[PDB]
């Protein structure tokens, strides 16, 4: 930890990191360069309460635990020179650094087939995006969402609640193929269908003409707006240019170190080890952004602290469904607690591998989620009959381990 | 480049690196720890001329260009402490380092279904392996090879030449699925079949009983010996333990830097950027081992030298077929020069993407290979009619660019 500290990006990972630096006791210079001209804010509301209620002052991140930080908002870092230990900014200034931290996140992947479209096509990542989408979210309007992932489905639910007609195109035979159990994805598809979402599976957009979207099955979908949610690509251009190991994401170890001395990275821009799979993955969860940012900061201030070690988890709020998912999407067995029904949805899934809990899902069952994460963390191997048994208290079972 | 230099592993990548350090002008200490108690040697002969002729003094690597290097042969590096800058050796000694280089390569992946077998099952990676296999390679014996990759097929050819009956089981519908054009793989399968190799495609070993191998189609193959060639796994255990970013291979940039200050890696143990695909891959070729070792050394001695930048290529000698393959296995088009025939096999493949040469294969046509690699290197976009035309001289075409 060499002063001064410069952080590129002013999202959740950046804020979490700088607050932890200060809290851990680092009092040297911290300068944060953020390309959006926005007080740092949290993104999940953009698909939900913000999209619905429009108040950005309800979604700002609290920078209170990060005192004495200079935030350069509306400035783009253009390059860094890792030999000179400098960063070049879009406003013509240069920042020196002792330690450079890349927290530049990811940007929505564009749909190559809609590139030259002449109807509204938006992605949903920023406050600017949400405002632009929002300004077209009139009741009875026709929305086409491309991509049946977390963001697409969160938007789908919000749009339906607002009285917008929603069609959604997904290339896979299922929703949420990236980070959800099949059982969950099947249920989620049935829920959205029942709420009036027109789901199109195993279909791709081949292009568009005068407000009509064309599909690979040779059919059409007329829409007033297309929102594309087909994933993100890491904002790793500065790292690539400077010679760091990257591949749609900057490779880091559990200390957040890149392959370049004195340059660290954290959050959505990183490819890191998933301790459950033991594979490198871009982990794009809110919890990763916060906890990885905190872990890297903690270890920079105190080298005796452990590396980042948290197991991955996320939530997704989709209308009546409060979904929570931890760990791996599958194992050799799934245990279902509760019935899976559109009538007052409430259930839990537990994924096991060779008797060990490797994943869990809760739908409208937050009570169960925290104990399951504890069981997951220690690689617990509880009685599978007990795990299935409705009489079992998971919080009690977790404590017993 | 801080002295002293310690290299873990004494294979081709290690030898290439240390020779280049000396040639580039580094004269400080170099100590190489090699777990095999063997004068450093080259591995390709082990599936061919060594397997056939048995003279290990014909396969040693020339360490002449690496003067004043201490080679600790028959010693295993057990761990390194990247804070203390020390390496712990199996003989109880500790080495200090200014710069640590991990060149520990890869080890044959074992077949989980043959783990408790009671017939000879060998892998083919070392001189010890080759000698053990060789001592069972009697004419008229029955050899089963598992895996239809480069090593399996090189061994298959050598075994057939020696009068050994050869059956070969492959899980994929094709041979060499990892790094060969389909057109090549199809031809290679026809060649081996014509030489008497009993090929079993889309089959897996489910186990074995008293000298009989069991398959997933529910059938049997009796054999006197099984050689397993189903790929390798990076020898990255020390890196993993020490906190470096690894995932079946140590991630490095074009300078060979790992995520750990003062620790580099090179050769088969590395995951690195393939400049043609722009993706990270474990590149396990002989040419990578040499050229990456040289590039990393060159840049350590002279920081103004460029990073490693070579495009991937390899050869495979399989009986009458002298195969050479460069770049990517496929593009949007393949151009074939010559006819593809078992009657005096001689042909060239050129893979193009958006008109640019992105890959090439030569079978018994070495003359064409070097010019095609030059065309590949500069991303040439020659006239496709000229590329197809038999009257075209590729060496002349390359020079014209
Ligand atoms: C619509 C939406 C809904 C979401 N809902 C959920 C959810 O339900 N569950 C969940 O787990 N997560 C959710 N996420 C939240 C998401 O997980 C976090 O926002 C993300 O993980 C934060 O990661 P980050 O801080 O690394 O990156 P970012 O938030 O992307 O921040 C990086 C910042 O750096 C900026 N930047 C990039 N390059 C430069 C440069 N050169 N110079 C200066 N600045 C630069 C970027 O523009 C960006 O402002 C949602 C996200 C969106 C967009
Ligand atoms: C049978 C066979 C046939 C081949 N034919 C071809 C071919 O046709 N074309 C082609 O391109 N390539 C061929 N290859 C050659 C291959 O590409 C090279 O041998 C390889 O790329 C060399 O890489 P390396 O030096 O990084 O690793 P290695 O050669 O594996 O050397 C690493 C060395 O480090 C040692 N080591 C590992 N851990 C430790 C430790 N902790 N302490 C000390 N020492 C350690 C290993 O045991 C090994 O001796 C073939 C290989 C084999 C085995
Ligand atoms: N578990 C998580 O990783 C998680 C959870 C919540 C939020 N997030 C945030 O959301 C971001 C990604 O959001 P997203 O929902 O856009 O991506 P996503 O990966 O969650 O889903 C994209 C979906 O689009 C589909 N798709 C891909 N190409 C397509 C195409 N051409 N046409 C139609 N469908 C296509 C995929 O199959 C997938 O179902 C992340 O960066 C992260 O910050 C991530
Ligand atoms: N192009 C190259 O990367 C290249 C070229 C020459 C030599 N080499 C050397 O060879 C090593 C790998 O050699 P290899 O031939 O053993 O691996 P390989 O990857 O070349 O081929 C392994 C083959 O086994 C098949 N396979 C995987 N699992 C199987 C299973 N369970 N049952 C049956 N088949 C299975 C794969 O489909 C593949 O065709 C590398 O480390 C490298 O050092 C590499």
Short mmCIF file of C-alpha atoms in Angstrom, two decimals, chain A residues 114-121 208-212:
data_model
loop_
_atom_site.label_atom_id
_atom_site.label_comp_id
_atom_site.label_asym_id
_atom_site.label_seq_id
_atom_site.Cartn_x
_atom_site.Cartn_y
_atom_site.Cartn_z
CA UNK A 114 -29.85 -4.08 -33.98
CA UNK A 115 -26.77 -1.90 -34.48
CA UNK A 116 -28.28 0.24 -37.27
CA UNK A 117 -31.84 0.26 -35.91
CA UNK A 118 -34.18 3.24 -36.39
CA UNK A 119 -36.49 2.56 -33.42
CA UNK A 120 -35.61 3.12 -29.73
CA UNK A 121 -33.09 0.51 -28.56
CA UNK A 208 -35.30 -4.83 -37.46
CA UNK A 209 -37.38 -2.74 -39.91
CA UNK A 210 -39.43 0.44 -39.22
CA UNK A 211 -40.39 -0.43 -35.61
CA UNK A 212 -40.62 -4.19 -36.16
#
